[PDB]
Write a protein that binds this ligand. Structure first.
Ligand SMILES: O=C(O)c1cccnc1Nc1cccc(C(F)(F)F)c1
Ligand SMILES: [Ca+2]
Length: 119
C-alpha cells in the first residue's frame, strides 16, 4: 500500500523527501495520460501500468493492499509469503523505488499543469 510504497522510497532515496515524488511529471502521483516528460516520469509511467495490471487480479487494490517486504542495508526484498496480488504490487513498488534512485530529478518537472501538458 501507499504507506509501504512511501516507505520503500524513503529507504531507497533517503536524500530526498518522498513528497518530491508525489506530484511530478505526468505519471508520478495521479494521472495516467500523456508523454512522460523524463526518465523519472517514465519510472512512474511503468509504475502506473503495473498497478493497472495488478488491478486485473480479483480483489486486488494496489493502493490498499498490504504486502510483506523489507528494506535493510540498501536492499529491498518482497518476501516469499505474498499471495499473487501482494507479490505483484510489491514488485510494482519495488521496481519503481529502484528506478527512482537511478533517475535524475528535474525541479522544473515538479507539479506541472496536467490539464494542459499531459493532454
Ligand atoms: O506515484 C508515486 O510515485 C508516489 C510517490 C510518493 C508518494 N506518493 C505517490 N503517489 C500517490 C498517488 C496517489 C495518491 C497519493 C496520496 F494519497 F498520497 F495522495 C500518492
Ligand atoms: Ca499516477
Amino acid at each position: 500500500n501507499l504507506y509501504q510504497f512511501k516507505n520503500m522510497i524513503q529507504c531507497t532515496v533517503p536524500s530526498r523527501s518522498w513528497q518530491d515524488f508525489a506530484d511530478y511529471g505526468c505519471y508520478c502521483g495521479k494521472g495516467g495520460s500523456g508523454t512522460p516528460v523524463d526518465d523519472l516520469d517514465r519510472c512512474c509511467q511503468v509504475h502506473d501500468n503495473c498497478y493497472n495490471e495488478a488491478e486485473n487480479i480479483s480483489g486486488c487494490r494496489p493502493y490498499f493492499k498490504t504486502y510483506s517486504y523489507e528494506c535493510t542495508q540498501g536492499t529491498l526484498t518482497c518476501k516469499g509469503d505474498n499471495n499473487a496480488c501482494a507479490a505483484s504490487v510489491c514488485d510494482c513498488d519495488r521496481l519503481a523505488a529502484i528506478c527512482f534512485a537511478g533517475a535524475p530529478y528535474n525541479d522544473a518537472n515538479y507539479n506541472i499543469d496536467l490539464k494542459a501538458r499531459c493532454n
